[PDB]
Design a binder for this molecule. Sequence first.
Ligand SMILES: [Mg+2]
Ligand SMILES: [Mg+2]
Ligand SMILES: [Mg+2]
Ligand SMILES: [Mg+2]
Ligand SMILES: [Mg+2]
Ligand SMILES: [Mg+2]
Ligand SMILES: [Mg+2]
Ligand SMILES: [Mg+2]
Ligand SMILES: [Mg+2]
Ligand SMILES: [Mg+2]
Ligand SMILES: [Mg+2]
Ligand SMILES: [Mg+2]
Ligand SMILES: [Mg+2]
Ligand SMILES: [Mg+2]
Ligand SMILES: [Mg+2]
Ligand SMILES: [Mg+2]
Ligand SMILES: [Mg+2]
Ligand SMILES: [Mg+2]
Ligand SMILES: [Mg+2]
Ligand SMILES: [Mg+2]
Ligand SMILES: [Mg+2]
Ligand SMILES: [Mg+2]
Ligand SMILES: [Mg+2]
Ligand SMILES: [Mg+2]
Ligand SMILES: [Mg+2]
Ligand SMILES: [Mg+2]
Ligand SMILES: [Mg+2]
Ligand SMILES: [Mg+2]
Ligand SMILES: [Mg+2]
Ligand SMILES: [Mg+2]
Ligand SMILES: [Mg+2]
Ligand SMILES: [Mg+2]
Ligand SMILES: [Mg+2]
Ligand SMILES: [Mg+2]
Ligand SMILES: [Mg+2]
Ligand SMILES: [Zn+2]
Lengths: 110, 116, 53, 101, 142, 47, 154
Amino acid sequence: TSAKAVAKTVRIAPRKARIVIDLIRGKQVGEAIAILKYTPRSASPIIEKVLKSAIANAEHNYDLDINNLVVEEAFVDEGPTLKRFRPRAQGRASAINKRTSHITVVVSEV
Amino acid sequence: PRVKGGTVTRKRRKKIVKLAKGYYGSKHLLFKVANQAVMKSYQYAYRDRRQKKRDFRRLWIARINAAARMQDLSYSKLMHGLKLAGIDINRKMLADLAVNDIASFNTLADSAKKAL
Amino acid sequence: AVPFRRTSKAKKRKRRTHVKLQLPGMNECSNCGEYRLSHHVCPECGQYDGKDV
Amino acid sequence: MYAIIETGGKQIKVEAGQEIYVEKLAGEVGDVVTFDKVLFVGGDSAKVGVPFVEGATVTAKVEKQGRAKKLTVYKYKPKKNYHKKQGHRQPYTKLTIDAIN
Amino acid sequence: RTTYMAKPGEVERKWYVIDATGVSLGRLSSEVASILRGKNKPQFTPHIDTGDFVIIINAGKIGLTGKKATDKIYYRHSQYPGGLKSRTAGEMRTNNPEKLLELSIKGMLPKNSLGRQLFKKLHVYGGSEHEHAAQQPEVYEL
Amino acid sequence: LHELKPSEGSRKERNRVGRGTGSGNGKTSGRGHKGQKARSGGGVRLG
Amino acid sequence: NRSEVRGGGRKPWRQKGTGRARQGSIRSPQWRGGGVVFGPTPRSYAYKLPKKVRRLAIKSILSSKVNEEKLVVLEGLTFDAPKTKEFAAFLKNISVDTKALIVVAGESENVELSARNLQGITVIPAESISVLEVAKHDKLIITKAAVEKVEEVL
RNA sequence: CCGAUAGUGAACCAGUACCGUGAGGGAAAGGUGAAAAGCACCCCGGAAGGGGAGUGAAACAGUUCCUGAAACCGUGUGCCUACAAGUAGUUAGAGCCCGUUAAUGGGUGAUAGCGUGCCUUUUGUAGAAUGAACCGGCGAGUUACGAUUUGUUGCAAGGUUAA
RNA sequence: AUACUCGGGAGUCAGACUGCGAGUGAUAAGAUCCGUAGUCGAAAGGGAAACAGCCCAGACCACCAGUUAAGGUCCCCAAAUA
RNA sequence: GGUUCGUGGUAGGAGAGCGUUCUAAGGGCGGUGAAGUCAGACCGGAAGGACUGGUGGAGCGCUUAGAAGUGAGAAUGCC
Ligand SMILES: [Mg+2]
Ligand SMILES: [Mg+2]
Ligand SMILES: [Mg+2]
Ligand SMILES: [Mg+2]
Ligand SMILES: [Mg+2]
Ligand SMILES: [Mg+2]
Ligand SMILES: [Mg+2]
Ligand SMILES: [Mg+2]
Ligand SMILES: [Mg+2]
Ligand SMILES: [Mg+2]
Ligand SMILES: [Mg+2]
Ligand SMILES: [Mg+2]
Ligand SMILES: [Mg+2]
Ligand SMILES: [Mg+2]
Ligand SMILES: [Mg+2]
Ligand SMILES: [Mg+2]
Ligand SMILES: [Mg+2]
Ligand SMILES: [Mg+2]
Ligand SMILES: [Mg+2]
Ligand SMILES: [Mg+2]
Ligand SMILES: [Mg+2]
Ligand SMILES: [Mg+2]
Ligand SMILES: [Mg+2]
Ligand SMILES: [Mg+2]
Ligand SMILES: [Mg+2]
Ligand SMILES: [Mg+2]
Ligand SMILES: [Mg+2]
Ligand SMILES: [Mg+2]
Ligand SMILES: [Mg+2]
Ligand SMILES: [Mg+2]
Ligand SMILES: [Mg+2]
Ligand SMILES: [Mg+2]
Ligand SMILES: [Mg+2]
Ligand SMILES: [Mg+2]
Ligand SMILES: [Mg+2]
Ligand SMILES: [Zn+2]
């Protein structure tokens, strides 16, 4: 009835992925793909591949109608953080979180 | 033998956090602020079980006052009248009659006037 | 200089009410049959929707 | 026809077939309870008490002898390391009123 | 338990018209506050608003005993430095009597959200003519 | 051996200080507030 | 304890100025891998009540067994060869079918061996009868020769 | 006696890594499954990563893979919220939404009353005094030998053994 | 209705204000130092707007019962436009 | 079992208890699902204790005694 794709531990900060994923939530897949194509953000290409993967799953595995699909669910979960250090003045090092994202897109008929 | 701090701590703190259900933001999530909020809620509830009794008597008295002034008595005269008459009906019952059975309240207000 | 109190979740979320993207200004082309930015050249057809190149 | 009776240091307004909660009375679940202290009788002939209406009674049958929902009474004094927690369940008798006399 | 509590729009709110002529500003105000609050009704419920609507007419003829006409000062501060303006009760009874009675009565209403709703039920007129004839106002005596 | 009952009053439970205010020996653990006698190893020699 | 834990020697950082809690050693007890404050030390738990109380205790536990009727006095008890099947059969003939302390005098090497592999059964000399051994077992099977030796002591 | 913040500093290639000119200081880090049967094949994708299919008792056991709490981050929505001045609750209380360990039930809360966190330290702290960002774990009257006193038990003008 | 005696265990040795009686001071101080009583300290509740130390009064728990204290009764705000 | 007088409380004295790990002994539960974990409107005067369902996948209660590394919200605590 619905088809899901996940991109696990993508090396992009969740906040940066979410501000884009919020555009495509509830949209028809055709419009969703257009919105991502014309949203100039680092997250857009990554979310496009998850969405097109979900559509391929819907067509190949569950034999759903691709022209009829809507983005039922889309959300970004925190992945494991890479911990780094930037040297600051006076010998002090400051933490840098190289955060990762799990990007989930679910597509459904209507 | 060694006793590690296993489970008893989590069980105790989780009960306190559940008692803080419905409280704003951190107050329903975090043990330290939930524990303060629950202590304070219990203190207010203790205080308010006493205040509740005062509050309802003020409500009843205000309603008896309103219904008595419709019979050309103040609350202070009516209650004196009922005392002299020997009528022992309490303010909660009078306030109930004054809203629900005004005819009955007027009968008592007459008994009061007679005693005065 | 420094935050006097940590910012609550509610207050943080209220501040971010306006931190969002707008949808791109796009529309379906006739010759292509796919979406394009207005006042831009459509790559699907490979030229400007109106003016042929 | 409704009456006002004195029960458990309080006054309550009863009609026939009404189910009331009062302070614990002596009585098994079958037992009939007579209230002798009737302050007022209403309904088309207001009989008024000075203070109790002589020969007036309300009869009821005991439906349940129970304990109210658990209350937790907790006191503390800030900065004095004083806390006191106490559980409370107030006993009650659930009566159904049979007849006003 | 069993104590009655009025519901919003349960108690019939009536329209009263009160002639202010020759009555002390207070005395009129204190009685009107009680009517607005619903203290004269046995259905009175502290959280609901069971009170009546009040039209005051002839507010220009409102009484000010002693030297209150010249000596009772009404202050406003803009919240700008040195932004304190003052008016005498007398000047305000001549030029803005609707304002004078509103100030007087506002002070005698509960200082809360419900108190601000009660104030909306008060209509003050300097002269003898209001335009609320549609509400079929009934004359009220103090 | 599953029904052992030591003589009534021969054994008593030891008092444990510093285990919360409910016990009456919490926080200051019976020592009161400050001074030499409140300190670890505190107290003057016998006489 | 904080003295016995590896390392700890130095003050981890200066007393004042760093904005950190003052610390004396990385093996202080509030530190993760640090010393234990009190906790177990090797000690004996052994103590003896006076001789007279210890004699009263064995007399009283043995009297209890007679009162309850758990004491079975055997004429002989011996085995030609160490045979556990024979000892098991013996216990059924006496109708034990519980835990039981067997007390024997005459060397009877075959009695110890024959009962060794049975789970509830303990065979002891008679000189070796103790309050805890009698308390650990339901029935007390004793040979006449052993009774003589127990009475000889008590 | 400990059971992975414990027990050795070290359950693991640890006096290692790392720090220091050097003497010296000195970590972190255990668990797929009974068995690799460790996912053929198809699909989207450059890959990563997914979705099927298959293995298996289980894959929400998928090569760091028993369990998987809390902080913290999200998606969805039942009730409320844009005239209000708020230590955030509590008491009263409509309305709306539910239906339980079945109880004078659960969720939410228009409006009304009352209401200055916790701890420490103080004559006195809501304090414009101290401490705590949050959650978790760890983290403080112990043992030995003496003294004394109370209780218990045995024996009693006796009682008791030490090595 | 307690005293006293003998044992075991303490904590306390920064006090505060109010009234009264004194000193010091200026017949100043929320000053200071004694005496005497009270409250706070270690005391919630009601009043004094708010307000440890003032006025009234002591919280074992529950009640949508009642009577009073100081203080109050035109409205905010319960009770007299006595 | 009644009667009478009591039951604010810091330092502090006194008492009775709850719960944690381990041992003994009795007696049990558990792949027809142990511990843990999650949820709930249940029970006790308190510390606390059950029940039911999810997750979990193999150990754990109870009774009476015994022994303690036995209870954390604060230490500019340590990780
Ligand atoms: Mg440098
Ligand atoms: Mg004790
Ligand atoms: Mg104490
Ligand atoms: Mg504390
Ligand atoms: Mg201290
Ligand atoms: Mg001191
Ligand atoms: Mg001291
Ligand atoms: Mg050292
Ligand atoms: Mg700092
Ligand atoms: Mg040191
Ligand atoms: Mg280590
Ligand atoms: Mg260690
Ligand atoms: Mg280690
Ligand atoms: Mg572990
Ligand atoms: Mg992993
Ligand atoms: Mg609004
Ligand atoms: Mg406005
Ligand atoms: Mg700080
Ligand atoms: Mg001793
Ligand atoms: Mg002074
Ligand atoms: Mg004095
Ligand atoms: Mg003090
Ligand atoms: Mg007080
Ligand atoms: Mg007040
Ligand atoms: Mg205080
Ligand atoms: Mg009263
Ligand atoms: Mg009275
Ligand atoms: Mg009034
Ligand atoms: Mg007490
Ligand atoms: Mg008392
Ligand atoms: Mg003690
Ligand atoms: Mg265990
Ligand atoms: Mg778990
Ligand atoms: Mg400990
Ligand atoms: Mg912490
Ligand atoms: Zn085109």
